[PDB]
RNA sequence: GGGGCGGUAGCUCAGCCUGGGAGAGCACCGGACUGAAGAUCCGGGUGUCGGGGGUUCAAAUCCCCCCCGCCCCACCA
RNA sequence: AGGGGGAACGCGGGGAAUUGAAACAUCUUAGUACCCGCAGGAAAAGAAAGCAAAAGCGAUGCCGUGAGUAGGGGCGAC
RNA sequence: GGGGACCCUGAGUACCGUCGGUUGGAUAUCCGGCGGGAAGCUGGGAGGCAUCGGCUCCCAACCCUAAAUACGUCCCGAGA
RNA sequence: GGUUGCACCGUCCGUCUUGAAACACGGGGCAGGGAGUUCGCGGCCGUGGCGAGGUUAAGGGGGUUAAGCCCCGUAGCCGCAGGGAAACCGACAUGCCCGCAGCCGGGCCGGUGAGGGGCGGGGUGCGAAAGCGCCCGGAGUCACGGCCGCGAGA
RNA sequence: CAGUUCGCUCCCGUGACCCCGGGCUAGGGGUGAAAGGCCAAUCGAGGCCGGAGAUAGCUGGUUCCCGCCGAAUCAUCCCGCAGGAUGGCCUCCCCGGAGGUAGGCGGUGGGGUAGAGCACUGAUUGGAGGUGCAGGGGGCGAAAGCCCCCGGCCUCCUGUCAAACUCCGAACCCACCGCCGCCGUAGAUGGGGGGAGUAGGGUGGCGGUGUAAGCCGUCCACCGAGAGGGGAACAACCCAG
RNA sequence: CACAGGUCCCAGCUAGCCCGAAAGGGUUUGUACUGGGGCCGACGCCUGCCCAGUGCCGGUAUGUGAAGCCCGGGUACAACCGGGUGAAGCACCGGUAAACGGCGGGGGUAACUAUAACCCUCUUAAGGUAGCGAAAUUCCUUGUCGGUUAAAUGCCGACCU
RNA sequence: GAGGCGUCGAAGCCCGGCCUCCGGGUCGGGUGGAGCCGUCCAUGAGACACCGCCCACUCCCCGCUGUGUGGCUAACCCCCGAAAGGGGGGACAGCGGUAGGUGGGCAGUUUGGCUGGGGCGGCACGCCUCCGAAAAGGUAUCGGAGGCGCCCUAAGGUCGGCUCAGGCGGGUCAGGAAUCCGCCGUAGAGUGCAAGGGCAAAAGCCGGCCUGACUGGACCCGUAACAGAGGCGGGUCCAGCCCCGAAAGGGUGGCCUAGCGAACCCCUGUGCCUCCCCGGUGGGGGCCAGGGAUGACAGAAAAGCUACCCUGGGGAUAACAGAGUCGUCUCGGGCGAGAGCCCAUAUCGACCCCGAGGCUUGCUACCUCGCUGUCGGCUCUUCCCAUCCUGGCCCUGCAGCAGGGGCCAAGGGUGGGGGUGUUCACCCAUUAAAGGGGAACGUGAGCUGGGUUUAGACCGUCGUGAGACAGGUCGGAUGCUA
């Protein structure tokens, strides 16, 4: 669960191992914005298909872990392959 | 699901739920063709008749324009009475004048709702309204309900009580005699109970005894759901 | 995951914009009192006041990071 | 100066459902069936605030082609 | 045929806002209802998002229109 | 050929069913009626034409009583280059080794071996890089008939 | 006799009575003294025509002969189970091409079922001898006191036997190589294409469950789709294709 | 089933309620002694208790609450993004059962022969009250006891958990 | 910024309004008539020295703007009327457009599969392990045992040193443990967690260092044996970057096997590609990879009733009966514990063991769903004996009278009443005795139709409700000419 605040691991950008700083992946709202949003303009009377939101859970105790690992040497984030399922993640010092 | 119910049929004009209008011979107007004001008009009690359609006493009055129209009879009436209309009518039992000329504390009937339409309130047999308070702004009258309504003093009304009473609601005695009243009116009778009429016919009941939904119903509910206690604020009388 | 409100002395909390060592009652303990039954007095303190840091002259509450409870909302980015 | 009729066709409105999706509601059936008004021997469209291969053209129908192509759609069937 | 000031030269329109219907019509179909609302060819519109610029074409808010295209009542001719 | 005796054998028919002579279902008897059709598209196949090209549709001219056949029309489609989301880039008219058919030489064997199989190199996409994907040493096009799917009332 | 009849019996017979003629109320609507009853031999929602040859995984049926090859009723998924699709499998055609190994033997590999046993992991039956000890009884009492004793708690040579135990373990199955046999160039061995079908039964062996019959695995001659002779007859028992 | 009788409910008429696509129409030649809707079913005696839940109704400080409108950011314009304003509605408060409905469990304990009048406890708001009952629905069961009957799984009477 | 302001008239004296934490400041009248200050710098933070803009609570004129409310009528509208006009109300409202709330009033639908028929219950519906599994492999059941949908950032990585529960004796303590000393000890220890297998210079134990639980692209197998079959998982490579180690060499997380999820859609990280005559900008679209659900688990969007029902089918499947079957039931035989004063058998008879029958109950799903109509009674008849009586016989704890027990035997007989619909069962008095069982649970093309029992109804229980009942109850067609 605990993971260090800074930790040395591989950076593809600079193509070398270096220290990365951890924060959480942050995701956008809707309501402009997208081609899927424009798909929800057929909910005028579109009660059966896609824009009615197909009303059903079931909806899963877990999530996986998704955690930006941020480069110090160029300031660009990366997200990558992980599989740490977590229900009580804590970020701590390091 | 279910179909139109008992009230919903009435509004349609259905013939089981329509009044006869040819054994009826009623209505009362004070002649609004000459407005509320004007003394121009007097009449003579021509007869005291039975009106068949209101099952009530009525008086026939013969005007000096030469027109025959009914005025709702007072108590103590006797043929050959003079009824006068206009503000120049004396304040007397069975005479008709505007509210302003009428003093407070006196029994009154046949008051106009809106000035010049010959009455819209208090036209029932044996029932009478009492003039409690009077202001030249607005004249407050106490209704058969007990509710004080404000009226404009240009409205016409007549002094006295209305004749009869104890004869527009007295014991029905038996089914035969009760039946004779419903031909004189229009009410759907005999009518069974909803509780063991099906849940197709009526929202409540089944085949067995048991209700289906509670009697007192929302006021904002649609038509065809006004059953039970309709627009009730409270129910029952004991704990 | 977003918003708001309450977690304070053993308990429930007041002030939170009204800032400091600073609160209040009620349990509980001690004392009168009583043949008994019964009622009523008189004392005592337990939280810089949920955690950790900063601005401030002396801030619990302001700021920055939050645990716990509750109400209204939210998977595939 | 008119009603009304006329074999279908034509113009303008109103406008389903069984069915398909192995069920079912968007979608599909279909702008179909069905209904109302109305004209003719064709009807209607029709002499440019058009096209847009930026180049080339200058009223309008229809047939062949462009093509099951662009695009739509439980992105499922269609 | 050439000479000066070029002429409101068509309004609830153009276009925008809200909601639908409809179509392949996708940000960019077409039309309707409700609300707002222009300009004067010196101007406006269009070329499949918005806006501003270049370039090109083109004038809505007036009307009609022959000929080539649909039918099957009818007549004749014909049959893997 | 009609009918019949003897010896021997022999529990209909069709359907349903794991099993039917059936106490499973259906039939009185005879005659007539009585059920795999058309269109589009896709995938197969056989034949036939032409060939790195092939094939014309609509139409009018033409011919004929009409019409078909005959000629014109190449609009347009497909193949001759593929990869890639697109930007955009772009290849072997076979170099090496086996071996069937066949040919040749010897007396089953030893060559030569199209087709074919097995390598190498190349084109493109992803890619720091490496590694994989697809493609590459000229055959298609149209016609006829038939087989089958799916869409249609099928 | 009658798509509601006949006889007898019964209820009502001045009444909320019966009865005629005209008119009125029409389909999720009426009408109903309330049965989901009735609304023209049709009502838990009338008839008619159009949409329309609605749809079915569901029943029945689908017509001339002959020749050749000749099944599967298993496997995965599915709002799927009395249904489809995709294999395995069946047939027809085409392509490449020389071995193939169902058979049997030896060599080189794999193995715990029958059987068998105490050597473990293991559950437990029984008496001895220890008196090693937690303790319920007694004694020099100081009620198990130093010390011995008796339910007894657990050693020890012994004592019952073990799908999920083993100090062990056949017959037998199967992989591979060589040989031999047989098969093959009228094309085997393998590939691609087109067209399908996709309820099983059954004796025995080895089983698992369940008193059993029945159900379900596995291999199987066979019936299914295969006659004939024998078993009195007797789908699958025998002989025989 | 109807029924006379009983109860509860709403509405001042430019009403309530309801019909109609619209134009309009019923109740209504009506006016609270009216007429509309449920619930119960002559007469006699009565109708206990509970609003915790569900329904209805009134009110609602505080909280929340859409679009329209407004402000700030964005955009050369527009999309867009942020905040306030945020009604009915909901949380919330009260009332209301002849509105729907609900009307209970365990131990211990009395001379003694029994049993438990008696006392504890708790879910959830209340804990069955006037009555009646081995019911036309006391399971078990053909209870038990009696009447009638030589004999009665019946009937009727009684006890009645 | 340590100084600035004034004789246009200032402190400082005298009062008025004044607020307050009575700290001290503001302020109108006047006497006045020319200073008061800060510096020193006390003060956490410094100057009404002077000059600027400001932050608290808050108040007021003026300019702009909403809403709320009251008056007006000019729109507009409701009332009356034959009109004319009056009456009432009034920008409320009526009407058009739009948004939220409510909304079985109405309509279209759905509510799964598995299964000893259905349904409860359970789920063996996804996945892991031993055994079942027949000594290679595949291998089923609502077959046994028993688990996973997480936990750990050390419970990971690498290297060096080191080897264990447990027992034995000695010390310490209340025995004991941690802890100490020696001896024994091939694995019984430990490895997070089911189970199994693996392992002792280790994967067990310790110390130090370290964060590869890494990026990218393959390969292979399971998944799904052979043999099709997605997704997903692991192992194994190489390339790149690190880590540790003396290096060799190891590390694609946790010794291995459970701890996971499509099509689509969205968002993140990063760069580029692209967006309709053309550019700039805004805003879009796209390639890749990562993350997000379908748990009914190769993935619909979902609650009930039908005895008012309808149709297609099905004997692949329930009710009656039969067949099969025989646990259950009925009955028998063998052995003889035991009491009967004594004496097992005059009589009674346990424990246990073995058969027979089809008569109770149940299992079977074979036969029928284009019907093989149920039970009881009635009437009418056949057969069987393990025989109630009559006949003939034997014993006795047989005195007689009278019992008890045993053997042969279906020829004949074996009744009437009271309750129940009742087969059966209970009861009365008679009788020589008042026997049982099979025959479509004999007997409905013979009767009856009382009971099972449909469409009507009430009550109890339960349910929001429709509606249900092996609860009670009333009433509810018996066709046909052989």
């Amino acid at each position: 669960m605990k993971y260090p605040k800074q930790i040395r691991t591989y950076c593809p950008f600079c193509k070398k191992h270096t220290i990365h700083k951890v924060e959480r992946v942050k995701k956008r709202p809707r309501s402009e914005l997208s081609a899927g949003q424009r798909r929800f303009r057929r909910i005028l009377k579109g009660y059966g298909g896609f824009p009615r939101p197909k009303p059903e859970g079931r909806e899963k105790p877990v999530k996986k872990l998704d955690l930006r690992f941020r480069c110090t040497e160029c300031g660009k984030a990366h997200t990558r392959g992980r599989g740490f399922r977590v229900k009580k993640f804590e970020l701590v010092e390091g | 699901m279910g179909k139109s119910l008992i009230q919903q049929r009435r509004g349609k004009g259905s013939p089981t739920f329509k009044s006869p209008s040819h054994r009826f011979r009623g209505a009362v107007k004070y002649i609004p063709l000459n407005y509320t004001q004007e003394k121009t008009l007097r009449g003579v009690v021509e007869e005291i008749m039975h009106d068949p359609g209101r099952t009530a006493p009525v008086a026939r009055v013969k005007f000096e324009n030469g027109i025959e129209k009914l005025i709702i009879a007072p108590e103590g009436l006797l043929v050959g009475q003079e009824i006068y209309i206009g503000p120049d009518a004396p304040i007397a039992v069975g005479n008709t004048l505007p509210l302003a000329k009428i003093p407070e504390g006196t029994y009154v009937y046949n008051i106009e709702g809106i000035p010049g339409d010959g009455g819209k309130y208090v036209r029932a047999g044996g029932t009478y309204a009492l003039v409690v308070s009077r202001e030249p702004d607005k004249v407050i009258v106490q209704l058969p309900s007990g509710e004080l309504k404000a009226f404009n003093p240009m409205c016409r009304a007549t002094i006295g009580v209305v004749a009869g009473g104890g004869r527009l609601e007295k014991p029905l005695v038996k089914a035969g005699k009760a039946y004779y009243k419903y031909k004189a009116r229009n009410k759907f009778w005999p009518t069974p109970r909803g509780v063991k009429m099906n849940a197709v016919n009526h929202p409540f009941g089944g085949k067995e005894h048991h209700p289906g939904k509670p009697t007192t119903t929302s006021r904002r509910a649609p038509p065809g759901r006004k059953v039970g206690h309709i627009a009730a604020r409270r129910t029952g009388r004991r704990k």
Coordinates of all heavy atoms in Angstrom, one line a residue, chain I residues 49 65 146 164-165 179 189 235 259 268 284 288 297 403-404 407 442 447 449 480:
Chain I
rA49 P 1.5 64.1 16.1 OP1 1.2 63.1 17.2 OP2 1.6 65.5 16.4 O5' 2.9 63.7 15.5 C5' 3.2 63.5 14.1 C4' 4.2 64.5 13.4 O4' 5.5 64.1 13.5 C3' 3.9 64.6 11.9 O3' 2.9 65.6 11.6 C2' 5.3 64.9 11.2 O2' 5.6 66.3 11.3 C1' 6.2 64.1 12.2 N9 6.5 62.7 11.9 C8 5.7 61.6 12.0 N7 6.3 60.6 11.5 C5 7.4 60.9 11.0 C6 8.4 60.2 10.3 N6 8.2 58.9 10.1 N1 9.5 60.8 9.8 C2 9.5 62.2 10.0 N3 8.7 62.9 10.8 C4 7.6 62.3 11.2
rU65 P -31.2 52.2 -15.1 OP1 -31.5 51.9 -16.5 OP2 -32.1 53.2 -14.4 O5' -31.3 50.9 -14.3 C5' -30.6 49.7 -14.8 C4' -30.7 48.4 -13.9 O4' -29.9 48.6 -12.7 C3' -32.0 48.0 -13.4 O3' -32.8 47.4 -14.5 C2' -31.7 47.2 -12.2 O2' -31.4 45.8 -12.7 C1' -30.6 47.9 -11.6 N1 -31.0 48.9 -10.5 C2 -30.9 48.4 -9.2 O2 -30.5 47.3 -9.0 N3 -31.3 49.3 -8.2 C4 -32.0 50.4 -8.4 O4 -32.4 51.1 -7.5 C5 -32.2 50.8 -9.8 C6 -31.7 50.1 -10.8
rG146 P -15.0 -30.2 5.1 OP1 -14.9 -29.9 6.5 OP2 -16.3 -30.4 4.6 O5' -14.2 -29.1 4.3 C5' -12.9 -28.7 4.6 C4' -12.3 -27.7 3.6 O4' -12.3 -28.3 2.3 C3' -13.0 -26.3 3.3 O3' -12.9 -25.5 4.4 C2' -12.2 -25.9 2.1 O2' -10.9 -25.4 2.4 C1' -12.2 -27.2 1.3 N9 -13.2 -27.3 0.3 C8 -14.5 -27.8 0.4 N7 -15.2 -27.7 -0.6 C5 -14.4 -27.1 -1.5 C6 -14.6 -26.6 -2.8 O6 -15.7 -26.6 -3.3 N1 -13.4 -26.1 -3.3 C2 -12.1 -26.0 -2.7 N2 -11.1 -25.3 -3.2 N3 -12.0 -26.3 -1.4 C4 -13.1 -26.9 -0.9
rC164 P 20.0 -26.7 13.4 OP1 21.0 -26.0 14.2 OP2 19.9 -28.2 13.6 O5' 18.5 -26.0 13.7 C5' 18.1 -24.8 13.2 C4' 16.6 -24.9 12.8 O4' 16.4 -25.6 11.6 C3' 15.7 -25.6 13.8 O3' 15.4 -24.7 14.8 C2' 14.6 -26.1 12.9 O2' 13.6 -25.2 12.6 C1' 15.4 -26.6 11.7 N1 15.9 -28.0 12.0 C2 15.0 -29.1 12.1 O2 13.8 -28.8 12.0 N3 15.5 -30.4 12.3 C4 16.8 -30.6 12.2 N4 17.3 -31.9 12.3 C5 17.7 -29.5 12.0 C6 17.2 -28.3 11.9
rA165 P 14.8 -25.1 16.2 OP1 15.0 -24.1 17.2 OP2 15.3 -26.5 16.3 O5' 13.2 -25.3 16.0 C5' 12.4 -26.0 16.8 C4' 11.1 -26.2 16.2 O4' 11.2 -26.9 14.9 C3' 10.3 -27.2 17.0 O3' 9.4 -26.6 18.0 C2' 9.6 -28.1 16.0 O2' 8.4 -27.5 15.6 C1' 10.6 -28.2 14.9 N9 11.6 -29.3 15.0 C8 13.0 -29.2 15.0 N7 13.5 -30.4 15.1 C5 12.5 -31.3 15.1 C6 12.6 -32.7 15.2 N6 13.8 -33.4 15.4 N1 11.4 -33.4 15.3 C2 10.3 -32.6 15.2 N3 10.2 -31.2 15.2 C4 11.3 -30.7 15.0
rU179 P 15.2 -16.5 22.2 OP1 15.6 -15.7 21.0 OP2 15.0 -18.0 22.2 O5' 16.2 -16.2 23.4 C5' 16.6 -15.0 24.0 C4' 17.3 -15.4 25.4 O4' 16.3 -15.8 26.4 C3' 18.3 -16.4 25.4 O3' 19.5 -16.1 24.8 C2' 18.3 -16.7 26.9 O2' 19.0 -15.7 27.6 C1' 16.9 -16.8 27.2 N1 16.4 -18.3 27.1 C2 16.4 -19.1 28.2 O2 16.8 -18.7 29.3 N3 15.9 -20.4 28.0 C4 15.4 -20.9 26.8 O4 14.9 -22.0 26.8 C5 15.4 -19.9 25.7 C6 15.9 -18.7 25.9
rA189 P 5.5 -29.6 10.1 OP1 4.3 -29.1 10.8 OP2 5.4 -29.7 8.7 O5' 6.8 -28.8 10.5 C5' 6.8 -28.2 11.8 C4' 8.1 -27.4 12.0 O4' 9.2 -28.0 11.5 C3' 8.0 -26.0 11.2 O3' 7.2 -25.1 12.0 C2' 9.4 -25.6 11.2 O2' 9.8 -25.1 12.4 C1' 10.1 -26.9 11.0 N9 10.3 -27.1 9.5 C8 9.6 -27.8 8.5 N7 10.0 -27.7 7.3 C5 11.1 -26.9 7.4 C6 12.1 -26.4 6.5 N6 11.9 -26.6 5.2 N1 13.2 -25.8 7.1 C2 13.3 -25.7 8.4 N3 12.3 -25.9 9.3 C4 11.3 -26.6 8.8
rG235 P 6.3 -15.8 -14.0 OP1 6.9 -15.8 -12.6 OP2 6.2 -14.6 -14.9 O5' 7.0 -17.1 -14.8 C5' 7.0 -18.4 -14.4 C4' 7.4 -19.3 -15.6 O4' 6.3 -19.1 -16.6 C3' 8.7 -19.0 -16.4 O3' 9.8 -19.7 -15.8 C2' 8.3 -19.5 -17.7 O2' 8.3 -20.9 -17.7 C1' 6.9 -19.2 -17.9 N9 6.6 -17.9 -18.6 C8 6.5 -16.6 -18.1 N7 6.5 -15.8 -19.0 C5 6.6 -16.4 -20.1 C6 6.6 -15.9 -21.5 O6 6.4 -14.8 -21.9 N1 6.9 -17.0 -22.3 C2 7.0 -18.3 -22.1 N2 7.3 -19.1 -23.2 N3 7.0 -18.8 -20.8 C4 6.7 -17.8 -19.9
rG259 P -5.7 -15.8 -10.6 OP1 -6.3 -15.3 -11.8 OP2 -4.2 -16.1 -10.6 O5' -5.9 -14.5 -9.6 C5' -7.3 -14.0 -9.6 C4' -7.4 -13.1 -8.4 O4' -7.5 -13.9 -7.1 C3' -6.3 -12.1 -8.1 O3' -6.4 -11.0 -8.9 C2' -6.4 -11.8 -6.7 O2' -7.5 -10.9 -6.3 C1' -6.7 -13.2 -6.1 N9 -5.6 -14.0 -5.8 C8 -4.5 -14.5 -6.5 N7 -3.7 -15.2 -5.8 C5 -4.1 -15.1 -4.6 C6 -3.3 -15.4 -3.4 O6 -2.2 -15.9 -3.4 N1 -4.1 -15.1 -2.3 C2 -5.4 -14.6 -2.3 N2 -6.0 -14.6 -1.1 N3 -6.0 -14.1 -3.4 C4 -5.3 -14.4 -4.5
rU268 P -7.8 13.5 -20.7 OP1 -7.6 15.0 -20.9 OP2 -7.7 12.7 -21.9 O5' -6.7 13.1 -19.7 C5' -6.8 12.9 -18.3 C4' -5.7 11.9 -18.0 O4' -6.0 10.6 -18.5 C3' -4.3 12.2 -18.5 O3' -3.6 13.1 -17.6 C2' -3.7 10.9 -18.6 O2' -3.2 10.4 -17.4 C1' -4.8 10.0 -19.1 N1 -4.8 9.8 -20.6 C2 -4.1 8.8 -21.2 O2 -3.1 8.2 -20.6 N3 -4.2 8.7 -22.6 C4 -5.2 9.2 -23.3 O4 -5.4 9.0 -24.5 C5 -6.0 10.1 -22.6 C6 -5.8 10.4 -21.3
rG284 P -12.1 20.7 -27.8 OP1 -12.4 20.1 -26.5 OP2 -10.6 20.5 -28.1 O5' -12.9 20.1 -28.9 C5' -12.5 18.9 -29.5 C4' -13.2 18.7 -30.7 O4' -13.0 19.8 -31.8 C3' -12.8 17.4 -31.4 O3' -13.6 16.3 -30.9 C2' -13.0 17.7 -32.9 O2' -14.4 17.5 -33.2 C1' -12.7 19.2 -33.0 N9 -11.2 19.3 -33.2 C8 -10.3 20.0 -32.4 N7 -9.1 20.0 -32.9 C5 -9.2 19.2 -33.9 C6 -8.1 18.9 -34.7 O6 -6.9 19.3 -34.6 N1 -8.5 18.1 -35.8 C2 -9.8 17.7 -36.1 N2 -10.0 17.1 -37.3 N3 -10.8 17.9 -35.2 C4 -10.4 18.7 -34.2
rC288 P -3.9 2.0 -32.9 OP1 -3.9 0.7 -33.5 OP2 -5.3 2.4 -32.3 O5' -2.8 2.3 -32.0 C5' -1.5 1.7 -32.2 C4' -0.5 2.1 -31.0 O4' -0.6 3.5 -30.7 C3' -1.0 1.5 -29.6 O3' -0.6 0.2 -29.4 C2' -0.4 2.5 -28.6 O2' 0.9 2.2 -28.4 C1' -0.5 3.9 -29.3 N1 -1.6 4.7 -28.9 C2 -1.4 5.7 -27.9 O2 -0.2 5.9 -27.5 N3 -2.4 6.5 -27.5 C4 -3.6 6.4 -28.1 N4 -4.6 7.2 -27.7 C5 -3.9 5.4 -29.0 C6 -2.9 4.6 -29.4
rC297 P -23.2 -15.9 -16.2 OP1 -24.1 -16.0 -17.3 OP2 -23.3 -17.1 -15.2 O5' -21.7 -15.8 -16.6 C5' -21.2 -14.5 -17.1 C4' -19.9 -14.1 -16.5 O4' -20.0 -13.8 -15.1 C3' -18.7 -15.1 -16.5 O3' -18.1 -15.2 -17.8 C2' -17.8 -14.6 -15.4 O2' -16.9 -13.6 -15.8 C1' -18.7 -14.1 -14.4 N1 -18.9 -14.8 -13.2 C2 -18.0 -14.5 -12.2 O2 -17.0 -13.8 -12.4 N3 -18.2 -15.1 -10.9 C4 -19.2 -15.9 -10.7 N4 -19.5 -16.3 -9.5 C5 -20.1 -16.2 -11.7 C6 -20.0 -15.6 -12.9
rG403 P -64.0 -72.2 25.5 OP1 -64.8 -71.4 24.5 OP2 -63.5 -73.5 25.2 O5' -62.9 -71.3 26.0 C5' -61.6 -71.3 25.5 C4' -60.6 -70.8 26.6 O4' -60.5 -71.9 27.6 C3' -59.3 -70.7 26.0 O3' -59.1 -69.4 25.4 C2' -58.4 -70.9 27.1 O2' -58.3 -69.8 27.9 C1' -59.1 -72.1 27.7 N9 -58.6 -73.4 27.4 C8 -59.4 -74.4 26.8 N7 -58.8 -75.6 26.8 C5 -57.5 -75.3 27.4 C6 -56.5 -76.3 27.7 O6 -56.6 -77.5 27.4 N1 -55.5 -75.7 28.3 C2 -55.4 -74.3 28.6 N2 -54.2 -73.9 28.9 N3 -56.5 -73.5 28.5 C4 -57.5 -74.0 27.8
rG404 P -58.5 -69.3 23.9 OP1 -58.8 -67.9 23.4 OP2 -59.0 -70.4 23.1 O5' -57.0 -69.6 24.0 C5' -56.1 -68.8 24.9 C4' -54.8 -69.6 25.0 O4' -54.9 -70.8 26.0 C3' -54.2 -70.2 23.8 O3' -53.6 -69.2 23.1 C2' -53.2 -71.3 24.4 O2' -52.0 -70.7 24.8 C1' -54.0 -71.8 25.5 N9 -54.7 -73.0 25.0 C8 -56.0 -73.2 24.5 N7 -56.3 -74.4 24.1 C5 -55.1 -75.1 24.4 C6 -54.9 -76.6 24.3 O6 -55.6 -77.4 23.9 N1 -53.5 -76.8 24.6 C2 -52.6 -75.9 25.0 N2 -51.4 -76.4 25.1 N3 -52.9 -74.6 25.2 C4 -54.1 -74.3 24.9
rC407 P -49.4 -75.0 12.7 OP1 -48.5 -74.6 11.7 OP2 -50.6 -74.1 12.9 O5' -49.9 -76.5 12.3 C5' -48.9 -77.5 12.1 C4' -49.6 -78.7 11.6 O4' -50.6 -79.2 12.7 C3' -50.6 -78.5 10.4 O3' -49.9 -78.5 9.1 C2' -51.5 -79.8 10.5 O2' -50.9 -80.9 10.1 C1' -51.7 -79.8 12.0 N1 -52.9 -79.2 12.5 C2 -54.1 -79.8 12.3 O2 -54.1 -80.9 11.7 N3 -55.3 -79.3 12.6 C4 -55.3 -78.0 13.1 N4 -56.5 -77.4 13.4 C5 -54.1 -77.4 13.4 C6 -53.0 -77.9 13.1
rG442 P -60.6 -51.5 -7.0 OP1 -61.0 -50.4 -7.8 OP2 -61.3 -51.7 -5.7 O5' -60.9 -52.8 -7.8 C5' -60.2 -53.1 -8.9 C4' -61.0 -53.7 -10.0 O4' -61.5 -55.0 -9.5 C3' -62.3 -53.1 -10.5 O3' -62.0 -52.1 -11.6 C2' -63.2 -54.3 -11.0 O2' -62.8 -54.7 -12.3 C1' -62.9 -55.3 -10.0 N9 -63.9 -55.5 -8.9 C8 -63.8 -55.0 -7.6 N7 -64.9 -55.4 -6.9 C5 -65.7 -56.0 -7.8 C6 -67.0 -56.5 -7.6 O6 -67.6 -56.4 -6.5 N1 -67.5 -57.0 -8.8 C2 -66.9 -57.1 -10.0 N2 -67.6 -57.8 -10.9 N3 -65.6 -56.6 -10.2 C4 -65.1 -56.1 -9.1
rC447 P -74.6 -45.9 -16.2 OP1 -75.2 -44.9 -17.1 OP2 -73.2 -45.6 -15.9 O5' -75.5 -45.8 -14.9 C5' -76.9 -45.9 -14.9 C4' -77.4 -45.9 -13.4 O4' -76.8 -47.1 -12.8 C3' -77.0 -44.7 -12.5 O3' -78.0 -43.7 -12.8 C2' -77.3 -45.4 -11.2 O2' -78.6 -45.7 -10.9 C1' -76.6 -46.7 -11.4 N1 -75.1 -46.6 -11.0 C2 -74.6 -46.8 -9.7 O2 -75.4 -47.0 -8.8 N3 -73.2 -46.7 -9.5 C4 -72.3 -46.7 -10.6 N4 -71.0 -46.6 -10.5 C5 -72.8 -46.7 -11.9 C6 -74.1 -46.8 -12.0
rG449 P -77.4 -38.5 -8.7 OP1 -78.3 -37.5 -8.2 OP2 -77.4 -38.7 -10.2 O5' -75.9 -37.9 -8.4 C5' -75.5 -38.0 -7.0 C4' -74.0 -37.8 -6.8 O4' -73.3 -38.8 -7.7 C3' -73.4 -36.5 -7.5 O3' -73.5 -35.4 -6.6 C2' -72.3 -36.8 -8.4 O2' -71.1 -36.1 -8.3 C1' -72.1 -38.3 -8.1 N9 -71.5 -39.0 -9.3 C8 -70.3 -39.5 -9.5 N7 -70.1 -40.2 -10.6 C5 -71.4 -40.1 -11.2 C6 -71.8 -40.6 -12.4 O6 -71.0 -41.2 -13.2 N1 -73.2 -40.2 -12.8 C2 -74.0 -39.4 -11.9 N2 -75.2 -39.1 -12.4 N3 -73.6 -39.0 -10.7 C4 -72.3 -39.4 -10.4
rC480 P -77.2 -40.5 -24.0 OP1 -78.6 -40.4 -24.5 OP2 -76.9 -41.2 -22.8 O5' -76.3 -41.0 -25.2 C5' -76.5 -40.6 -26.6 C4' -75.7 -41.5 -27.5 O4' -74.3 -41.4 -27.3 C3' -76.0 -43.1 -27.3 O3' -77.3 -43.5 -28.0 C2' -74.8 -43.7 -27.8 O2' -74.8 -44.0 -29.2 C1' -73.7 -42.7 -27.5 N1 -72.8 -43.0 -26.3 C2 -71.9 -44.0 -26.4 O2 -71.7 -44.6 -27.5 N3 -71.0 -44.2 -25.4 C4 -71.2 -43.6 -24.2 N4 -70.3 -43.8 -23.2 C5 -72.3 -42.7 -24.0 C6 -73.1 -42.5 -25.0

